[PDB]
Nucleic acid binder design. Structure first.
Lengths: 77, 72, 76, 73, 73, 77, 76, 72
DNA sequence: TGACACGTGCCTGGAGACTAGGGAGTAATCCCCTTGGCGGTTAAAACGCGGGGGACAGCGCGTACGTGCGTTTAAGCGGTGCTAGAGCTGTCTACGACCAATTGAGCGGCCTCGGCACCGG
DNA sequence: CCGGTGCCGAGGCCGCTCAATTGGTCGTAGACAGCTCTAGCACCGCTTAAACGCACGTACGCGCTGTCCCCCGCGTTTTAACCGCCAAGGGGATTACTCCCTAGTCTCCAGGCACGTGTCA
């Protein structure tokens, strides 16, 4: 299932697109495809953040956990 | 407030699926920034492909190909 | 300069190769290339382990730090 | 001595110094050796495969670059 | 017509018959195509890599055998 | 006697290769080698799929059968 | 942690070895290595059997499930 | 004989670690047969390496080499 | 030649086998709606004959590019002992931010109508 | 030279789901000191580094033969896709039949650990 709501996600995708290209069209199956990928990416990122929290013998994830996880993965920020 | 449509309980639910038991209040602003960057990058490539093919229509396969090549 | 000793590194490389295929001889520039890659990889791994150590309010890296760094990148 | 022991403790320390760490636990050294071996095994396995494809008996620099590329990602 | 559609419905059925399958659900065909594409992509990616290592412009039968081995037959 | 049609399989193979490297020529015996391997792979997968169908007392194979076979073999699924 | 007791595991390993070769012995770290591998293998095999059970209209794993799992893996 | 030394509760424990919810009574005898085969194969290779090196003491590395070629 | 594993003793709670016992979870059974299988068929994309080129792999050979042996050695570097300095943790006290129960309030969703491009036959 | 289709854009109404309030409080931030431990100094031994030397293993480059890939006319050609009737079955609910998982009890024992000893790295 899609844990993120469909309609606000679609609006965001269209919002981001307006800055790259004016009035560009989309497809319905394209947004659903992007969302499955997006949710998998965020869930995976949350997995790594949790690993960082556990490494510090804590159970609460903090901003520093997200930043550590993305830096070691090689994600530029 | 279209960025605000990714609500706090939704992000918490995503974290639960990721195995998160406790969630700091500051996570939400941080996650939103991270999400925005991801979307920008994928869409930037997706639109590039559309323009290269002179089609002007984003196809589902274009996004899937963009996503695949992003992970590599 | 390469931080790993050249001759012992070369000996190790030849030993591992002998089990995949016997009697192979390595080109010199091939071993130096392999060594540059290895040292770059280890240095990068040491960067990430240190970030994990500092994250945990420590300054000394430990085996659990190395294992975390390799796990989040997707090595194991 | 064993050939895995030729990556000496001061060598591993130097690699760690270049990695930005100030102090290194005693257990790091054995851990680092294991990690290196796994990496080396994988690369060399691919490297030797390339050598056989080219019908050569000498692993060349070009063999390593292809091995590294497929393991680099 | 799309080239993935050339793996026709009766062809996939014949493969399943050879595999001992007597009846085949309608959803099998799309599933089989996806599986096939993933397999093909992986093999060809390695195959083309071998071709480039040999500094050739024509992928050879030998290229495929090495590609298949590293995939696992 | 290959079970997949020769010409469409060859066309598919060339299409995928163009995305890895453009302007490549395929040897005939290379494509025949690749095709023999692919058909053996699919037949073998269908053998295991059939075993999964019989396991569930269903004479008809379904997508869940293919997905189970590939997961137990160790293929990414 | 090891899930099978050392001494019964050791007896089985020694029993099998006695049939393969006369009077061969094993190092302590060798048996612990074999046991870690053995426990990982059984856990993995139990994962697949359970997956096979869930595929069928049941949640209880049966002898026929393991044999199917091992057949598809290419073992037996 | 020796397979009967391995306890019924241990195999149940293994299934819990494998994420198994319930266990049929007939699994245990079946599991024992499967286990014996695995060990034989691994040990057969281990002893082969020992004999190739003309040694009489099985080393930890011998098992690891046997294990690698079995898993591969 | 000395260190390692083999063999046995003492024991005690951890762990392992029956013996009742409730029952979640197996296994036949019917009807139905789904839904592939199979029969017709015809246009058609695949199979193929063959000229035609010709780009390009396969093969042989010269040679120099370089790997292996190995041999000494002066020498920078690793190993080991020892020390004094710094860092890895528990339980101290506390707080504040993170958890949840409750209530308006609003946006998500189902189903549908009206208008605009748009690649296309 | 015009067309069926996918699209936004909105609406009508139900409809679950938010932010905010308030409270209970779990967990996280310094930290003192016991503890490990390790970074560094100082020898001392030693194994890397190197330069010939010589011997040659062979990789790279280049040219020649082949041969097989690409192309396509284009001819014929076995057949894939579609419609539709037919019959096998997936399955959901029904219901009989458990043995599988718990507790209690009695017993077997895994391992520290210690001593004595044969054997090969």
């Amino acid at each position: 299932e899609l844990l993120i709501r469909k309609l606000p996600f679609q609006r965001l995708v269209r919002e981001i697109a307006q800055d790259f290209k004016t009035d560009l069209r989309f497809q319905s199956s394209a947004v659903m495809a992007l969302q499955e990928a997006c949710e998998a990416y965020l869930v995976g990122l949350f997995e790594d953040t949790n690993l960082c929290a556990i490494h510090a013998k804590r159970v609460t994830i903090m901003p520093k956990d997200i930043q550590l996880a993305r830096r070691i993965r090689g994600e530029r920020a | 407030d279209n960025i605000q449509g990714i609500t706090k309980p939704a992000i918490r639910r995503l974290a639960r699926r990721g195995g998160v038991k406790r969630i700091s209040g500051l996570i939400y602003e941080e996650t939103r920034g991270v999400l925005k960057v991801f979307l920008e990058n994928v869409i930037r490539d997706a639109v590039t492909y559309t323009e290269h093919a002179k089609r002007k229509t984003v196809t589902a396969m274009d996004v899937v190909y963009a996503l695949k090549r992003q992970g590599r």
